[PDB]
């Protein structure tokens, strides 16, 4: 079985490279962040532009949704995160304390916490209600490229250019596992599988790997794409067939069979590096977005 993703919409409006797209948990919305300092909200099914959210003083590298789809958090080169009320567009809180660019962010499932990663080599855990920093983890010895909570929020996984993935106990901030592999290539992305048992990690040697968190073992590797320079988002697709989805520096979206590791589809149409992909929570829909020469977001639909 192979998917048949086809282009449905191209969404234009960002005036610089797009950095990150994410579907709302309720499936209604796509949020996008950009080097142009803006967040934009779009209808997930009709592609209709809904609104622009502004206030950061420099570009935004990441954005993430609360579980109830009512809040957004953004990570910016202005060294802050911001918490936004989506319906009003207002900045509820500015999270201050990182000493360099904030690169990555995520809510926990309860959505009382935010985790952030920075070029300052730290991971920070923040209280949503007060905006205070609860914990600073001395997580890595190089920029932190990704941070993600597991399905109940008890664990954080982080990745770094230092070549490590680390698993942290949320409650205590203590490191539970370090993933190392061979020649330590920079790790550009990491995230938990939906069941929380596996971790998907990208390295800047054109490689994706699936790790069993319990065992410390690599189970699958995925290759054929181009990834040497950028921190590109990758995904588990679970609404139909079980795929791995990733952007690529050859301007394509790559889709693999998770079990067999065979490439099952490449989505053509972007005209610059595909820096971000996202998988819709219930429909077989992919959102992709590209860098400077393109600046658009594409929505794609498949029967499986």
């Amino acid at each position: 079985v192979k998917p048949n993703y086809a282009l449905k919409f191209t969404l234009a409006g960002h005036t610089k490279a797009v950095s990150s797209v994410k579907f709302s948990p309720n499936g209604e919305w796509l949020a996008s962040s950009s080097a142009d300092k803006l967040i934009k909200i779009w209808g997930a099914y009709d592609g209709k532009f809904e609104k622009t959210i502004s206030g950061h003083k420099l570009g935004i590298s990441d954005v993430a949704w609360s579980s109830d789809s009512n809040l957004l958090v953004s990570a910016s080169d202005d060294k802050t995160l911001k918490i936004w009320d989506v319906s009003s567009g207002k900045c509820l809180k500015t999270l201050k304390g990182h000493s360099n660019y904030v690169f990555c962010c995520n809510f926990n499932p309860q959505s009382n916490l935010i985790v952030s990663g920075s070029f300052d080599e730290s991971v920070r855990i923040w209280d949503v209600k007060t905006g205070k920093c609860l914990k600073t983890l001395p997580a890595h010895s190089d920029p932190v490229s990704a941070v993600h909570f597991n399905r109940d929020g008890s664990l954080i996984v982080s990745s770094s250019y230092d070549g490590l993935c680390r698993i942290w106990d949320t409650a205590s901030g203590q490191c539970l596992k370090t993933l190392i592999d061979d020649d330590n290539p920079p790790v550009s992305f990491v995230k938990f599988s939906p069941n929380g048992k596996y971790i998907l990690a990208a390295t800047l040697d054109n490689t994706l790997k699936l790790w069993d968190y319990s065992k410390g073992k690599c189970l699958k590797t995925y290759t054929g794409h181009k990834n040497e320079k950028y921190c590109i988002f990758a995904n588990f697709s679970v609404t139909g067939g079980k795929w791995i989805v990733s952007g690529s520096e050859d301007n394509l979206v790559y889709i693999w069979n998770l079990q067999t590791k065979e490439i099952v589809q490449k989505l053509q149409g972007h005209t610059d590096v595909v820096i971000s992909t996202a998988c819709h929570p219930t429909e077989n829909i992919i959102a992709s977005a590209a860098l400077e020469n393109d600046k658009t977001i594409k929505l794609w639909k498949s029967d499986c």
């Binding site: 950095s19 950009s34 080097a35 590298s61 990441d62 320079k229 921190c231 820096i275 400077e292």
Partner: peptide
């Protein structure tokens, strides 16, 4: 920025 190469 994520939009700049390493």
């Amino acid at each position: 920025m994520r939009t700049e190469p390493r």
